[PDB]
Amino acid sequence: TNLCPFGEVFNATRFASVYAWNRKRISNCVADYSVLYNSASFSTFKCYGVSPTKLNDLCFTNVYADSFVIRGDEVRQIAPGQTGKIADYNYKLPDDFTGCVIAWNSNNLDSKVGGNYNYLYRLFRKSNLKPFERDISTEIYQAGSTPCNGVEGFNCYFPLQSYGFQPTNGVGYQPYRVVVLSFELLHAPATVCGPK
Amino acid sequence: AQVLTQTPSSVSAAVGGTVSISCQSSQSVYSNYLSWYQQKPGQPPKLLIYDASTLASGVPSRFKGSGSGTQFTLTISGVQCDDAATYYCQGSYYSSDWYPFGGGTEVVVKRTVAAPSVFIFPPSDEQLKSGTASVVCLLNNFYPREAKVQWKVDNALQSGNSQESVTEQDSKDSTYSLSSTLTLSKADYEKHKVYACEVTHQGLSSPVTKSFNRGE
Amino acid sequence: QSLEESGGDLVKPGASLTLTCTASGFSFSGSYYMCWVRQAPGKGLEWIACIYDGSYDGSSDNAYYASWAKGRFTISKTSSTTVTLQMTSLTAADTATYFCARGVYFYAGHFVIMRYFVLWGPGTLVTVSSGQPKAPSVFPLAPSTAALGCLVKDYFPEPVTVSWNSGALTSGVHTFPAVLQSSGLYSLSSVVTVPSSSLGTQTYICNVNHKPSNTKVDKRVEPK
Ligand SMILES: *[C@@H]1O[C@H](CO)[C@@H](O[C@@H]2O[C@H](CO)[C@@H](O)[C@H](O)[C@H]2NC(C)=O)[C@H](O)[C@H]1NC(C)=O
């Protein structure tokens, strides 16, 4: 009964940028979901198609943990049917999403006096992301018909912008760590099970 | 509904040159899941690049992937002799049942012109018992691939009774070889003496005719 | 670390055939999808189907099919090391080498998306035809640098394997691609260039193996 390594996800030293969000596959283990839903530190814990307290009684084929860091007032965008820069261009959940979204304030970890510029988000795309799509392209965004040739300028914008988290920012602008758990259930032997 | 257009069908460069292979998708590729594969003759496809830029384990760094959205490119910076093969792009989309491959692109390693060595083999007495005669003309280690073989029986040009096949470009010599087989009845072989194979190639300033006489 | 396809055979039009993909050096444990990709002779690659390798033994669930192949093709996991592809209503358009491939998958909600194909087996050849298996005839090409070779004629179906001196002689060897004669039979030639001073000391034999007919013919090639 080897424990599922949820600590590797939730307790990692650094999280990924939302545009380059990270995914870890959890399989062949027993997951203690209680340590998640009985924790007081999560300011966002919202599940779809799943009851959080019941999770210790369910088995699944796989679990997928997507982790990233966003702005506080952008936490609302990590949900089905939402719009905005994060949902449109960075991380998109499907309408039929089956799983939980967990988020907590990480100002003490991801903010630096003078600004932490390691966390980025994508500003614009020609089209919205499809569910679970990932765009890590750093190509210059061509806003007009005049081409860009590796040169930023008028209607030629670099597509990634740094959050620049500072400890003195307002709570809506402070960093938040987000983990999205997706529960895959196929007609196959289940590999991720609760303690019961 | 989602088509990958791979242009051109053939590229060429000398050793150390750069060849560029384009892959165009009618629709944006999901998360830029565009991959490139190399297929050498007689071998299964071998993955070169995935996620449109990530190099697969053990693949030389001279293979480079680039592009996003609907336009992608495979670049071989520093083409080598063993890069003579067919290459394919493959795209993945927001779909569970459509993974199109590109039409493919041949890479030809350019080298100096090489005229073919011409050999001729008369049909064997072991075969002559059966009732058919096969005459084989060999063109060996020549570049470029384009060549012409003309069959002459008693100085008369033949038509419709010969088939030819060419080897792939050599991964060492970058040369081709061609075998032309002339098929005749036993009787038609037993009423002529001189059987000639005439070869036209860029390295042959005048056509070379290889001949033998039946019964020496 | 290894995949080996099997079951490719000469079948008549309208028949069914089941191909096997056998895993060597590992076992299926839910980490990949197993996929089939085919290639008609001289043509490109066409994806057929995939299946989650963590499926139950004997199950066809968790499978995806190209629209043209759906229903006519069935992919199944039969054991921890075997995946099969059953094809029915075969025609000449189904003649191809069939490759088994590991699919690296990405979970996207109610379905998964194949990211790329990492590991490809050597493939197995399916020939849909009304013709019968025919053993070849290995006729020498007597030498007159010297050139000598063997003529492999009147065989069906593909392939044939020609080696020289039991694989010892590899440099200067050219085995030409087969050509289909008007008789419905293939003809192939293999040649090698050797120094003419070794025509006396060294002996040269061509090892022609046509597996569909169990025809192993070794003919010594010496000047007449
Ligand atoms: C992330 O780290 C915290 C802090 O280490 C873990 O909290 C521990 O919880 C267990 C019970 O599950 C206690 O026995 C430990 O004493 C706690 N450690 C403390 C308070 O420092 C937390 O479980 C981790 N999150 C995971 C594994 O998902």
Structure description:
The complex is a heterotrimer of chains A (196), B (216) and C (224). Chain A is mainly beta and 196 residues long. Chain A has 4 helices and 12 strands. In chain A, the strands form 4 sheets. A 5-stranded antiparallel beta sheet of chain A has the order 1-5-11-6-3. A 3-stranded mixed beta sheet of chain A has the order 2-12-4, with no helix packed on it. The longest helix of chain A is centred in the middle third of the chain and has 6 residues. Chain A is globular and about 60 Å long. The relative contact order of chain A is 0.27. Chain B has 2 domains: 106 residues, Immunoglobulins (Immunoglobulin-like); 97 residues, Immunoglobulin-like. In chain B, 4% of the residues lie in helices and 49% in strands. Chain B has a 6-stranded mixed beta sheet with strand order 2-10-9-4-5-6, with no helix packed on it. In chain B, β4 and β5 form a beta hairpin. The relative contact order of chain B is 0.17. With 224 residues, chain C is an all-beta fold. Helices cover 2% and strands 52% of the residues of chain C. Chain C contains 1 helix and 19 strands. In chain C, the strands form 4 sheets. In chain C, strands 2, 4, 5, 6, 9, 10 and 11 form a 7-stranded mixed beta sheet that branches. In chain C, a hairpin with a 4-residue loop joins β9 and β10. The longest helix of chain C is centred in the C-terminal third of the chain and has 4 residues. Classes of the chains: A mainly beta (196), B mainly beta (216), C mainly beta (224). Chains in contact: A-B, A-C, B-C. The interface between B and C is large, with 52 and 48 residues. A molecule of 2 linked components (NAG-NAG) binds next to α1 of chain A. Chain A: It comes from Severe acute respiratory syndrome coronavirus 2. Chain A: This is Spike protein S1.
